Design a protein around this ligand. Structure first.
Ligand SMILES: Nc1ncnc2c1ncn2[C@@H]1O[C@H](COP(=O)(O)OP(=O)(O)NP(=O)(O)O)[C@@H](O)[C@H]1O
Ligand SMILES: Nc1ncnc2c1ncn2[C@@H]1O[C@H](COP(=O)(O)OP(=O)(O)NP(=O)(O)O)[C@@H](O)[C@H]1O
Ligand SMILES: C[As](C)(=O)[O-]
Ligand SMILES: C[As](C)(=O)[O-]
Ligand SMILES: [Ca+2]
Ligand SMILES: [Ca+2]
Ligand SMILES: [Ca+2]
Ligand SMILES: [Ca+2]
Lengths: 443, 446
């Protein structure tokens, strides 16, 4: 069921990333833009570009009728959602199907199983996947939370079932703080996502965050493309990602891959997706959630595996079979550094016009960016400049390679996190892999 | 070996190769020292260097060819080794000996091995004694115009006259008939005198519609020699390379295996240390013949890097420090790689287009390498070297690499000067290229 033309329902670096793969496969790449993004670089490269609305950028790109009408006028027979925006919108996936447009991504059934994080955990217990101890499904309210927290033991973390981007979570150390924390997370979740359902889990001290990339196809096969360590986090936001996660010994790594493949087959998962785990000092691992879409840091997995994940997403959507797991060879080490237009100490946005742009290059350096000299970055809305990705034979060489690349990135007119990443590459804790999700919080 | 450890390297070169060398040197943790003439003060790699020495007056590319200035730069910067790149001093035997005199490691082969292969007519003789096939021709240099006449009849027309000290494609004349021979001999002999100070000519049979295939080798100080596969560089304009690729799909595995073993045998026969390239021509029956060896890194090395996973310059440096190369068995050749040379010349006429680059946006993406030192606002002196950069892609097979080249080329946006981008885009769409029906003369009959 060949796809001939694909509309990219997204913007920024992922639009350009997708465009490149789409055009290499000989398919047509259709782009959309709000009036704010009319200077976007990939608009120059696309087979057609459709203006989909007002520069309330967040808005227009979420305007389902506009995206649909663009697919139809442009005669796209498929939509690639990327990440953010409409990629996890169940209503969009259904609507696409009603217009006989192929959503590249999983079925609504699977997306629905994992969309509420407390239920997702129950679905995983049924599949025999380890989860953090906590509430069994959602909390009835602040008084069920008090009861539960005493049984589990403090500290605990309250989490929004409908939560994302680290919003709607509160770590609670003593019972005397609980009620306040509950209602603070409830309010934030209510306003942010329209759903204030909370669940509770044990708060793991200094966990490593480790995720497994899978892709599933229409025949029930599911492969893994290795695991990524995303522990270097500021305020629960990922700054630096790596594959493989060297913390893991071979045996644990195999357990984790197998666990993730099993979870995917259990829910009928098709397309690209990621299972996130927390790993404690025991090297015990716990499922915390599944992302039902491609993620920002997928490039790290591409450089160790030699797979084009977006190409596989497209082939799976066309009815093709994935390659055998035995053909996937993971090699060497890959690091990604997110370059954003923020001050490297405060992480406060730094919008403005780029007056000089000289991106790094070289063997096994991949700068994923839609930016260029004279481009204006609207940092309030997407401070992302680009992802700097390197690959080497081992971790030390990847770190040395990343530092040379970062040094070669020349950007004027705005501040960037470049200096944050450079000082991280030189930080003995980073070099020695002695850190965790709260490392930045205590430095 | 630990006493032979290199801490600091001076790059006696300019342009894209200075930048390419700089990156590898700094990733290894050694100091990269750059040099520049006054016309190159705006060069991008001078901002990335640990130190930069101005070595003289621009106009004369002489400053890069000024040995005292280069040695003085190395000594003021406390460089313990010099990386020569290609062109310039990379094949200057006197500069090599001078380096050893000042206790500076020259990253490249010994003066002996370089001397053995430097006269192209004598090199063929060395290859024959090593049991390497060569093209029938003169046995050493021709005595002169009359010896050429007699010999061309023996070996049969057409023949090609070649300057023993030749390079760049200068000092060569194809001769199809005896009537043209004498005039051709003198035209080439005098060009060769002007260009090289040596007029020595040799002769070989002119292969019709040849494919140009070369093998990349690296040798170490232990006598180990590895290959990094072979490259097809057949798409030439006036004997100049424009597009290179690896592997050469023209070949079957048995011929590929024989060509690899021949290159390995040749390098051992001459005790070759460092990166080097063996050049062959391949005729209609898939027989191959040595035409020359390049005792240095070449421009198109990146193609072999992408199919093999080897940083060739990194290996060069390890070799200079006394390390052993990896085993042949550990070298895995995979997929397919293509390189397009982007130059500041009109895509139709190939006439230089000097000027300021007012817009520069390079391609990128998975398995795409733009090797370039240019940037927006840079001025390209195309009269002096018109290289903007090399665009190199890799993919799982040839057709996929060609489709990737087209997308990468489409995304290369340059303004203010003309480039060969359109030449390359039209080659990627040319059915003869896709079908692998071309040769060194294809562009000439089109
Ligand atoms: N039970 C836990 N114990 C310790 N740390 C946790 C726990 N749960 C979450 N965290 C931390 O909070 C981060 C994010 O949690 P997560 O469940 O992924 O929420 P989120 O808001 O969906 N994340 P995201 O939308 O992808 O940015 C994790 O990466 C951990 O660093
Ligand atoms: N015997 C031959 N028969 C047919 N073509 C030949 C022959 N010898 C050389 N050529 C052609 O001329 C090109 C260059 O020959 P070469 O001997 O490498 O001279 P050159 O000036 O040293 N090369 P270079 O300096 O590296 O650009 C070859 O690639 C062939 O296209
Ligand atoms: C993005 As959600 C917490 O509704 O799966
Ligand atoms: C001196 As020579 C013909 O080997 O470049
Ligand atoms: Ca999430
Ligand atoms: Ca998460
Ligand atoms: Ca030559
Ligand atoms: Ca040659």
């Amino acid at each position: 069921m060949e796809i001939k033309s694909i509309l990219i329902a997204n913007r920024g670096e992922i639009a350009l990333r997708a465009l490149r793969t789409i055009k290499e496969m000989g398919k047509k790449a259709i782009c959309v833009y709000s009036e704010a993004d009319k200077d976007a670089l990939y608009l120059k490269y696309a087979d057609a570009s459709i203006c989909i609305g007002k520069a309330r950028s967040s808005e227009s790109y979420l305007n389902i009728p506009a995206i649909i009408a663009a697919a139809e006028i442009a005669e796209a027979d498929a939509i690639f959602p990327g990440y953010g925006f409409l990629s996890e919108n169940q209503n969009f996936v259904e609507i696409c199907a009603k217009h006989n447009i192929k959503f590249i991504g999983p079925s609504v059934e699977a997306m629905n199983l994992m969309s509420d994080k407390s239920k997702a955990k129950q679905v995983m217990q049924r599949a025999g996947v380890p989860v953090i101890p906590g509430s069994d499904g959602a909390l009835a309210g602040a008084e069920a939370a008090k009861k539960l927290a005493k049984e589990i033991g403090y500290p605990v973390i309250l989490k929004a079932a409908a939560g994302g981007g680290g919003r709607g979570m509160r770590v609670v150390e003593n019972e005397k703080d609980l009620e306040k924390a509950y209602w603070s997370a409830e309010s934030e979740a209510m306003t942010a996502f329209g759903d204030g359902t909370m669940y509770m889990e044990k708060y793991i001290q200094n966990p490593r965050h480790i995720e497994v990339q899978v892709i599933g196809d229409s025949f029930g096969n599911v492969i893994h493309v290795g695991e990524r360590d995303c522990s270097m986090q500021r305020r629960h936001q990922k700054l630096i990602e790596e594959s493989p996660a060297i913390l893991l010994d071979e045996k644990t790594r195999t357990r984790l891959h197998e666990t993730a493949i099993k979870a995917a087959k259990a829910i009928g998962y098709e397309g690209a997706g990621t299972f996130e785990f927390l790993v404690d000092k025991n090297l015990d691992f716990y499922f915390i959630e599944m992302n039902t879409r491609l993620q920002v840091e997928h490039c790290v997995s591409e450089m160790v595996s030699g797979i084009d994940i977006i190409e596989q997403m497209i082939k799976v959507a066309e009815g093709y079979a994935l390659p055998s797991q035995e053909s996937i060879k993971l090699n060497g080490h890959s690091i990604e550094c997110r370059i954003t237009a923020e001050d490297s100490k405060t992480f406060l946005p730094s919008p403005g016009k780029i007056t000089k742009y000289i991106p790094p290059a070289g063997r096994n350096v991949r700068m994923e960016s839609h930016c260029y000299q004279d481009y204006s970055v609207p940092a309030y809305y997407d401070s992302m400049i680009g992802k700097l990705v390197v690959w080497a034979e081992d971790r030390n060489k990847a770190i040395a390679k990343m530092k040379v690349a970062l040094d070669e990135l020349l950007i004027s007119g705005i501040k960037t996190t470049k200096d944050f990443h450079l000082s991280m590459m030189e930080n003995p804790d980073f070099i020695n892999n002695n850190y965790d999700t709260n490392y930045l919080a205590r430095h």
